[PDB]
Amino acid sequence: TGRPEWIWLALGTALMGLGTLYFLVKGMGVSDPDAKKFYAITTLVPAIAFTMYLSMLLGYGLTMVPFGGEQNPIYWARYADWLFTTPLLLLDLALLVDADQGTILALVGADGIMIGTGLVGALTKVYSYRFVWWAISTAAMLYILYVLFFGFTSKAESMRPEVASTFKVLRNVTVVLWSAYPVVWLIGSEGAGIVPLNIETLLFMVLDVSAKVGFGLILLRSRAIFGE
Amino acid sequence: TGRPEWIWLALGTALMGLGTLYFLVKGMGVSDPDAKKFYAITTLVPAIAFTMYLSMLLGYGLTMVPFGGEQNPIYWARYADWLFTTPLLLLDLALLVDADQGTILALVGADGIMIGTGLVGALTKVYSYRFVWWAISTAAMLYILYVLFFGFTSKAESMRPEVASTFKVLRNVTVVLWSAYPVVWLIGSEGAGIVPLNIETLLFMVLDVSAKVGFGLILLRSRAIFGE
Amino acid sequence: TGRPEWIWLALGTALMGLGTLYFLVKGMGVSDPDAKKFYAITTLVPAIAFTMYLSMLLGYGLTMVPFGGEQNPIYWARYADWLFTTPLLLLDLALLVDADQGTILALVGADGIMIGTGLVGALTKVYSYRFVWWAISTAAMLYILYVLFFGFTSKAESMRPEVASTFKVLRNVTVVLWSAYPVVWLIGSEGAGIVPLNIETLLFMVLDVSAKVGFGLILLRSRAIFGE
Numbered sequence: 001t002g003r004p005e006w007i008w009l010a011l012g013t014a015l016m017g018l019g020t021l022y023f024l025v026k027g028m029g030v031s032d033p034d035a036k037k038f039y040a041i042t043t044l045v046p047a048i049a050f051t052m053y054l055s056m057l058l059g060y061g062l063t064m065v066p067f068g069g070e071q072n073p074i075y076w077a078r079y080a081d082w083l084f085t086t087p088l089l090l091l092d093l094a095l096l097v098d099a100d101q102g103t104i105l106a107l108v109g110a111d112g113i114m115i116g117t118g119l120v121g122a123l124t125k126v127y128s129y130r131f132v133w134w135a136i137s138t139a140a141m142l143y144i145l146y147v148l149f150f151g152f153t154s155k156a157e158s159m160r161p162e163v164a165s166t167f168k169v170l171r172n173v174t175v176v177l178w179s180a181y182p183v184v185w186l187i188g189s190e191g192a193g194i195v196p197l198n199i200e201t202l203l204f205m206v207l208d209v210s211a212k213v214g215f216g217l218i219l220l221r222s223r224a225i226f227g228e
Numbered sequence: 229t230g231r232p233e234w235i236w237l238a239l240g241t242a243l244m245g246l247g248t249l250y251f252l253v254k255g256m257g258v259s260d261p262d263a264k265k266f267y268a269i270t271t272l273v274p275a276i277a278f279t280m281y282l283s284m285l286l287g288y289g290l291t292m293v294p295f296g297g298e299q300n301p302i303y304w305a306r307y308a309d310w311l312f313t314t315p316l317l318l319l320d321l322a323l324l325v326d327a328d329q330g331t332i333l334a335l336v337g338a339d340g341i342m343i344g345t346g347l348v349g350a351l352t353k354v355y356s357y358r359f360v361w362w363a364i365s366t367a368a369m370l371y372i373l374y375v376l377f378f379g380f381t382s383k384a385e386s387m388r389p390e391v392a393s394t395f396k397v398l399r400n401v402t403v404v405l406w407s408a409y410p411v412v413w414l415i416g417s418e419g420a421g422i423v424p425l426n427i428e429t430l431l432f433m434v435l436d437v438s439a440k441v442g443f444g445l446i447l448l449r450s451r452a453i454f455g456e
Numbered sequence: 457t458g459r460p461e462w463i464w465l466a467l468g469t470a471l472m473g474l475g476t477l478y479f480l481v482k483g484m485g486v487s488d489p490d491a492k493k494f495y496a497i498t499t500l501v502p503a504i505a506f507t508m509y510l511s512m513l514l515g516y517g518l519t520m521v522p523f524g525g526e527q528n529p530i531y532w533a534r535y536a537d538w539l540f541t542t543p544l545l546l547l548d549l550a551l552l553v554d555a556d557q558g559t560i561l562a563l564v565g566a567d568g569i570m571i572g573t574g575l576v577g578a579l580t581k582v583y584s585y586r587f588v589w590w591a592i593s594t595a596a597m598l599y600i601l602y603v604l605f606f607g608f609t610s611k612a613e614s615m616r617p618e619v620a621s622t623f624k625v626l627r628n629v630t631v632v633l634w635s636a637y638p639v640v641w642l643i644g645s646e647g648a649g650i651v652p653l654n655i656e657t658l659l660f661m662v663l664d665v666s667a668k669v670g671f672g673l674i675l676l677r678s679r680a681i682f683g684e
């Protein structure tokens with residue numbers, strides 16, 4: 001493994017794998033149907049990331065994109081991961097607050113646009129246009145963060161204190177960690193090329209494990225996930 | 229931009245972009261959960277088309293398919309657009325009439341078959357077989373149009389007059405505009421090659437903007453989208 | 457058709473096509489909304505398989521994957537089929553028993569992991585790593601079979617005798633036929649290469665037609681699909 005970023009791909013694979021097994025074991029026995037939804041969503045998220053980390057580690061999830069005069073290593077498997085795991089994370093938030101279905105559809109669809117335009121930007125061979133896709137994807141992310149802070153103002157007169165409390169923490173966790181991903185992309189291998197791929201891969205590893213396994217530990221340890 | 233169809237890709241990009249912003253602004257403030265569903269579906273549709281028009285304009289959504297002795301320019305991004313936006317359009321219709329879930333699943337699944345076989349036909353290198361996929365996809369479209377006219381005969385004893393009225397108009401808009409897409413494909417660059425790609429791109433632009441932004445203006449201006 | 461497996465691809469195409477038309481005709485007239493769900497799911501399943509069998513027959517769904525020193529014919533279209541039809545089959549089971557939504561999401565997501573890791577294994581160029589993906593996919597299949605036997609223990613105090621009976625038979629049909637697919641893959645063209653592709657294609661044809669058209673005949677002939 002002649003790619004120096006292999007260690008972070010291996011560590012990411014192991015930590016997503018271990019978080020999947022932990023959440024699997026923890027959700028055994030659970031009969032509350034509301035809690036079963038949260039365990040299924042929250043366990044699927046690092047299970048999908050485990051498979052995509054492994055595909056990067058083994059090289060399957062890596063391709064070379066010509067741009068800027070250069071053959072650029074691009075890990076496309078990250079977008080196949082995020083396509084599914086970032087709407088699932090939004091679904092955990094949305095279920096906490098009993099979101100209306102129109103709000104869930106706005107969130108999941110804005111998130112698909114965010115990930116799909118991120119992927120088009122990652123694979124685009126004209127260097128300047130990569131950053132046009134980055135901006136569109138960021139605009140979709142900002143929409144999602146707007147909805148998470150301002151789209152549930154009908155949900156407060158009626159929201160169990162423990163649901164509000166856990167939703168607040170997870171929403172803060174989300175806004176901080178997810179906002180770092182466009183920055184990493186912009187300065188890393190896919191963007192300006194200021195931070196080398198080895199470091200980029202480290203940064204996404206720490207973000208992903210926090211946003212998936214850290215997030216899910218907070219959620220699944222709360223009694224907000226059970227019907228009262 | 230040495231592709232003469234660039235002007236229609238640019239115009240399509242702008243009109244889908246402007247229709248997205250208009251519907252975004254128009255749906256601000258809306259609290260009625262039924263109306264929020266219609267705004268989310270109807271706003272996502274031109275937002276997705278904006279991204280796919282832009283990918284065609286920038287060249288990312290174009291590939292060359294050998295067939296007929298020739299390297300043929302094929303805009304595959306149209307199928308990535310339609311994969312999502314044509315079930316969303318069907319969902320707006322189906323929600324208007326309070327469709328049963330089995331009818332929604334038939335519609336969304338027939339539509340996936342329509343778009344996916346359209347894409348296989350667009351990328352098929354044996355010329356005669358392209359038209360086998362065209363026929364299968366047309367058969368799926370005809371099924372969808374059948375369901376839209378004859379699959380909601382339990383929904384009339386109970387259907388607000390304004391819902392019936394808006395559903396009738398949008399269903400007519402749909403049947404007329406969607407039926408033109410197999411014809412354009414059959415005579416255009418993907419099919420018989422009778423109409424040049426520049427004109428084909430113009431035709432799909434006018435159809436798409438009408439079927440997305442025209443459709444959505446009719447829907448979102450009606451009080452059929454609000455619970456009574 | 458210089459591929460000896462063409463006959464089984466042609467036969468599979470015809471049998472999925474004929475089963476689609478039969479289920480289409482059989483579900484005409486059905487007004488019971490619960491029954492309409494089962495007809496839509498169960499009819500879409502062989503309709504999707506018909507398109508994917510046809511794409512294999514015509515060669516579109518075939519690619520060459522280098523591994524083991526060799527250019528290996530890999531029918532990738534099977535994974536595009538299964539991506540949709542295996543969650544749909546699980547949905548028919550889950551609706552029979554009135555599964556909780558968290559259980560449905562676990563099933564559909566485990567199934568996506570099963571098919572997507574199966575596809576990564578089928579396309580992986582390092583021979584030994586193909587079998588790592590096979591094992592992960594098998595682990596997801598075993599999870600699905602676990603849930604089908606042990607995830608509905610809240611659903612028995614309340615389950616119409618005819619629903620229990622039909623669910624039991626279809627679940628047995630599923631466990632036996634689906635468990636054969638990793639074995640065929642492991643000994644066939646995608647794995648160890650012990651069984652030639654011609655025979656492999658025969659085996660998957662018999663499995664698919666049984667698991668789709670055989671399964672659906674059992675389901676759609678039962679009164680378990682109607683609300684009582």
Ligand SMILES: CC(C)CCC[C@@H](C)CCC[C@@H](C)CCC[C@@H](C)CCOC[C@@H](CO)OCC[C@H](C)CCC[C@H](C)CCC[C@H](C)CCCC(C)C
Nearest residue numbers: 115116119291304308337340341344345351500504536540
């Ligand atoms: C609910 C159910 C009932 C639904 C039923 C399913 C229904 C659709 C029936 C099955 C049809 C279909 C799924 C199967 C055909 C797959 C098709 C894409 C195959 C083409 O790809 C094969 C290759 C190489 O030979 O061609 C070359 C590849 C091309 C150059 C690429 C062109 C294709 C586009 C890239 C498609 C874009 C779609 C994206 C995957 C959408 C998400 C991506 C995003 C978030 C960035």
Ligand SMILES: CC(C)CCC[C@@H](C)CCC[C@@H](C)CCC[C@@H](C)CCOC[C@@H](CO)OCC[C@H](C)CCC[C@H](C)CCC[C@H](C)CCCC(C)C
Nearest residue numbers: 168169171172173174175176177178179180181182183207
């Ligand atoms: C000029 C540029 C270089 C800067 C780029 C910024 C840009 C990308 C936008 C990001 C802003 C965003 C992170 C802020 C949103 C979170 C927070 C401020 C929201 C406040 O509201 C929530 C409150 C109360 O419930 O809790 C508060 C929740 C938390 C306690 C808020 C704490 C914020 C985080 C601690 C900051 C993230 C830390 C990084 C992940 C560390 C990486 C840096 C590295 C080089 C060591």
Ligand SMILES: CC(C)CCC[C@@H](C)CCC[C@@H](C)CCC[C@@H](C)CCOC[C@@H](CO)OCC[C@H](C)CCC[C@H](C)CCC[C@H](C)CCCC(C)C
Nearest residue numbers: 044048080084343344347519532536565568569572573579
């Ligand atoms: C709800 C959630 C819990 C679900 C969890 C997600 C779960 C599936 C886990 C993730 C696995 C998976 C999504 C990730 C792997 C992606 C896989 C397709 C990668 C293969 O493609 C990489 C390339 C180049 O190196 O190979 C060469 C490319 C090949 C030649 C092409 C073969 C692949 C097929 C084309 C696949 C067909 C699927 C279609 C996109 C379906 C729709 C298309 C249609 C409508 C026309």
Ligand SMILES: CC(C)CCC[C@@H](C)CCC[C@@H](C)CCC[C@@H](C)CCOC[C@@H](CO)OCC[C@H](C)CCC[C@H](C)CCC[C@H](C)CCCC(C)C
Nearest residue numbers: 396397399400401402403404405406407408409410411435
């Ligand atoms: C032989 C071939 C060349 C012809 C190909 C036809 C074939 C592809 C099938 C298409 C038929 C389809 C469009 C008809 C369905 C719509 C309509 C007749 C349905 C009637 O029922 C609805 C009624 C009452 O509510 O309103 C009625 C709704 C509307 C008022 C109906 C009006 C029909 C449209 C005005 C026709 C479409 C116009 C084109 C988009 C213009 C493009 C032509 C260009 C060259 C100028």
Ligand SMILES: CC(C)CCC[C@@H](C)CCC[C@@H](C)CCC[C@@H](C)CCOC[C@@H](CO)OCC[C@H](C)CCC[C@H](C)CCC[C@H](C)CCCC(C)C
Nearest residue numbers: 063076080109112113116117123272276308312571572575
């Ligand atoms: C609900 C709605 C509102 C949602 C709105 C949709 C929203 C996402 C907006 C549309 C964006 C997007 C869908 C369109 C862009 C498609 C994008 C994949 C195009 C890239 O592919 C083009 C090629 C050749 O030029 O590049 C080369 C190809 C690369 C080498 C491959 C890299 C891409 C990955 C393979 C993507 C993996 C995703 C898988 C299809 C997931 C399932 C596969 C699995 C089960 C094995």
Ligand SMILES: CC(C)CCC[C@@H](C)CCC[C@@H](C)CCC[C@@H](C)CCOC[C@@H](CO)OCC[C@H](C)CCC[C@H](C)CCC[C@H](C)CCCC(C)C
Nearest residue numbers: 624625627628629630631632633634635636637638639663
């Ligand atoms: C060492 C290896 C080579 C063996 C590999 C096995 C491995 C892949 C795991 C598979 C085990 C699995 C098929 C068993 C599950 C089914 C069954 C035993 C479950 C019992 O519980 C259900 C009961 C009561 O309702 O009905 C019972 C339901 C049925 C009546 C059970 C009958 C089992 C099937 C008849 C066996 C499958 C037959 C094959 C499809 C035939 C192909 C062989 C060919 C070479 C002729």
Ligand SMILES: *C/C=C(C)/C=C/C=C(C)/C=C/C1=C(C)CCCC1(C)C
Nearest residue numbers: 118134137138141178181182185211
């Ligand atoms: C599980 C992994 C998580 C939570 C990942 C989140 C990823 C994003 C918020 C990605 C955002 C991006 C942009 C806004 C701009 C373009 C680059 C992306 C895709 C990295």
Ligand SMILES: *C/C=C(C)/C=C/C=C(C)/C=C/C1=C(C)CCCC1(C)C
Nearest residue numbers: 346362365366369406409410413439
């Ligand atoms: C937003 C864009 C809309 C409403 C597009 C609709 C597209 C169709 C109805 C496409 C149909 C096709 C056929 C029936 C045959 C094969 C060619 C297609 C995909 C163009």
Ligand SMILES: *C/C=C(C)/C=C/C=C(C)/C=C/C1=C(C)CCCC1(C)C
Nearest residue numbers: 574590593594597634637638641667
């Ligand atoms: C309609 C076709 C059906 C029911 C197909 C089922 C396919 C599976 C159960 C496939 C399973 C696989 C594994 C568990 C290991 C990797 C190889 C696969 C994808 C064939």
